Symmetry: C2
Subunit: 182 residues, 2 copies
């Protein structure tokens, strides 16, 4: 378990924030998430930084073993297709938000990449920090930078408005789903 | 460009075909797709068995390079996460249908895998040969055996009756989208 990021952190700091289409108030950015905050890729030491306690808020996982974490991490890391991003409160040394960008590869559209935004969560006692908006914008604009032809996500109809702020529109296509688990 | 399949063909035959819920008249299978038809992993040779001709029936496939193709294929094969499956018409040597199962890795649900179905297309002269149904049942069931806790896809509302066949249900969730290319 080390500090080695999943992707090159230059990728985040080189994102053109002028291209952000959402209302920030106060105006924050990836470079300046807020007092005592760092927006960065996930690394292996984040295991001990309450990363699962932030994910698990969204949905109760089972005890993921350290070994299991590093395998998942490494496969994701050297795929080049996962951009698991985290906000750290440095003053407490804990993770306080996370969101994932997945690059999918296709053959259609000149062998193009499309993005998927997955697993956007912000810690319960850490609302009003705009880290949801912040991660969404960052991750959205990160996919453009990675030259995705498009980027998609699922949301509840109630938050359908929250996402229009990032350039997203409601597709006429339905999301369809089959559970094997439960 | 050679016959090297993207994943193990074994994976296809080991799909528990007794678990298919969809109707087939006549009863066709991963082993018996029809007279003169084989169901297999994509391989690089497929380039000139008109793979891109079929995909062209799904969506614009700009000037695609044999090399840009070969590279993309390799990355998908190297990940172990891409299951681009095709039907060759072994007699006429052409691909006549494709669909892809992408395996997606999580940290949630005890570092679970979920699957997506993408890029389902049947050549415009393979109607009545039941290939849509077959591909969609095969990968849905392949995802089960690969241990996906769920599998999902996106379709027009009018295509809904079709995917229910394999026990997909419409989600309560909006599918939202940003296009970068136009």
């Amino acid at each position: 378990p080390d500090e080695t990021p999943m992707f090159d952190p230059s990728l985040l700091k080189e994102v053109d924030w002028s291209q952000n289409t959402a209302t920030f108030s106060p105006a924050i950015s990836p470079t300046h998430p807020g007092e005592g905050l760092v927006l960065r890729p996930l690394c292996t030491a984040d295991l001990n930084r309450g990363f699962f306690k932030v994910l698990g808020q969204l949905t109760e996982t089972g005890v993921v073993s350290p070994e299991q974490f590093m395998k998942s991490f490494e496969h994701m890391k050297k795929s080049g297709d996962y951009y698991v991003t985290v906000v750290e409160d440095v003053t407490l040394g804990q993770i306080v938000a996370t969101a994932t960008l997945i690059i999918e590869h296709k053959f259609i559209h000149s062998c193009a990449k499309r993005g998927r935004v997955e697993d956007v969560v912000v810690s319960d006692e850490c609302r009003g920090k705009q880290l949801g908006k912040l991660l969404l914008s960052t991750l959205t604009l990160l996919s453009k930078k990675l030259n995705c032809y498009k980027i998609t996500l699922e949301c509840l109809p109630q938050n359908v408005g929250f996402y229009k702020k990032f350039g997203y529109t409601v597709s006429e296509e339905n999301y369809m789903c089959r559970r094997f688990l439960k």
